[PDB]
């Protein structure tokens, strides 16, 4: 009896359950939202212990057939903490690796940006936004200079990619923090449940994107805070906002 458990983000867990209905065994798989790319291997109660890159070749009456991809890379559940971003910071995500890359942004003076490698349709998960997990209080109480990469996860958690992990040479396990801001974005941040990173956010397209198109997201800072306005945002953002409101076609 094969069970499939689908997450709202489109990913899924699949395998035969044990006597106790637990997703425990050596033939369990996490399947990415493309319904093709998979991490296949040892899981315990749905937690990835040793998953290897695989392809979902076909499914017959709910029964999946996977075949391992070449290579020796293995992945495991490795949730970040307040001060550990990953146990394998330089081990990239294979699904992300086939879809996006980091390069100089097309946006003037905006450092690096995130780009698509492929033509995909709307609502496509492209990249993952993993990071250390800290409190809103910590983030809200410190300088904007330390808040370039903070992204609200939920009511108790903010995800951050702090120095020195904001440099690909030090951290490339996920790349969501490299997407620059735009008031006319082609992507959005969305919830994601990842077998390695746990509950995080992802970057999902709003519409079809082409190969080599820069991926942008609206950062969503508060433009008019309740405690006397002037957007609670970095200067570059406030500047771009003025430039946006101007040039806007009404």
């Amino acid at each position: 009896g094969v069970c499939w458990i689908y997450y709202p983000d489109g990913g899924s867990l699949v395998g035969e359950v044990n006597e106790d209905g637990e997703m425990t065994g050596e033939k369990i798989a996490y399947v990415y939202p493309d319904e093709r790319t998979a991490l296949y291997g040892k899981f315990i109660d749905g937690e990835m212990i040793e998953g290897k890159l695989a392809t979902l070749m076909s499914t017959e009456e709910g029964r999946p057939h996977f075949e391992l991809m070449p290579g020796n890379s293995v992945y495991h559940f490795d949730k970040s903490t307040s001060s550990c971003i990953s146990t394998n910071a330089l081990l990239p995500d294979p699904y992300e690796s086939e879809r996006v890359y980091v390069a100089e942004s097309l946006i003037s003076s905006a450092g690096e940006g995130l780009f698509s490698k492929v033509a995909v349709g709307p609502n496509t998960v492209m990249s993952f936004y993993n990071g250390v997990r800290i409190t809103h209080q910590e983030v809200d109480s410190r300088d904007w200079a330390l808040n370039g990469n903070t992204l609200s996860l939920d009511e108790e958690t903010v995800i951050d990619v702090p120095e020195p992990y904001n440099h690909v040479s030090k951290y490339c396990a996920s790349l969501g923090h490299k997407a620059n801001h735009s008031f006319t974005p082609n992507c959005i941040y969305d919830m994601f449940v990842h077998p390695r990173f746990g509950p995080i956010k992802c970057i999902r397209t709003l519409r079809a994107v082409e190969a080599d198109e820069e991926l942008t997201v609206a950062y969503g800072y508060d433009h008019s805070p309740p405690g006397k306005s002037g957007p609670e945002a970095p200067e570059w953002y406030q500047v771009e906002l003025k430039a946006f409101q101007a040039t806007q076609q009404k």
Partner: peptide
């Protein structure tokens, strides 16, 4: 506040 909001 000082963090992107999905």
């Amino acid at each position: 506040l000082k963090s992107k909001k999905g």
